[PDB]
Amino acid sequence: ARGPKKHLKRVAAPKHWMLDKLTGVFAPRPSTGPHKLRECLPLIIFLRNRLKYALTGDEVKKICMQRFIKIDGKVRTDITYPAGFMDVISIDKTGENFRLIYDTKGRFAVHRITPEEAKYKLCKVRKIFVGTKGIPHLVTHDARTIRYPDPLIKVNDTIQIDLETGKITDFIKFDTGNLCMVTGGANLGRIGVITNRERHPGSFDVVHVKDANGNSFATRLSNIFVIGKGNKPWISLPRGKGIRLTIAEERDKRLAAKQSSG
């Protein structure tokens, strides 16, 4: 090509959007924003496919142009806005609040939260650097740059940001024994406790996690997001507590639910 591409084929879209094949040829290409194209959820997909508020793309635009949707406390009229992990979506017209959290299947879930909880979010520290005049600067996973952070905050830590003022309230250090969620790879959507960290100079580090039931797995260091200190998360969790079931026990649960239905 001679420049940036502006379209997205529907079959080439991320598979966690759960788009069907026969609806059309194209899929909504996410706009540039805080989150990556392959790791976000466009506003239209969440607004018409997840919540069933709109039937077509035109109704999504008619909803958005009434300035009803807010993302992280700010009104967004873009229907392809990239909304990502640990983001807060507010609809004051219906009085609803949602937080984008992966489920155990690796898909963003419709997770309703209390309006009191909708006032803050968690962010992962991506970069620490000193700028002009010797002022420290901290860069998070969602492109937020914060000046004068706490001197004890380093990379791979978690900070709590108040969405109204955009300032750090407290933080969680990256240490063994804390609670973490996997944000990418084969174990995406799983929640557990960090066991140990393997350091490989010049390469990727590997971190081992063990869930509540005792199942152990491993991931890369870049795919881990610290949620809470110890066993207590600092956010509300979805229906599944982050434990991945096998196919056999999913079948058993489904059959038990069917037997008790009726």
Binding site: R147, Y148, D150, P151, L152
Partner: peptide, 30 residues
């Protein structure tokens, strides 16, 4: 905003340096 943020971080940095030096002094003395 610049003045207030600078003053607040100056206070925080003084607190952090004092805490670190106190802990190092306690470790050395013991």
């Amino acid at each position: 905003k610049n003045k207030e943020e600078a003053a607040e971080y100056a206070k925080l940095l003084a607190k952090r340096m004092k805490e670190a030096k106190e802990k190092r002094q306690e470790q050395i003395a013991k």
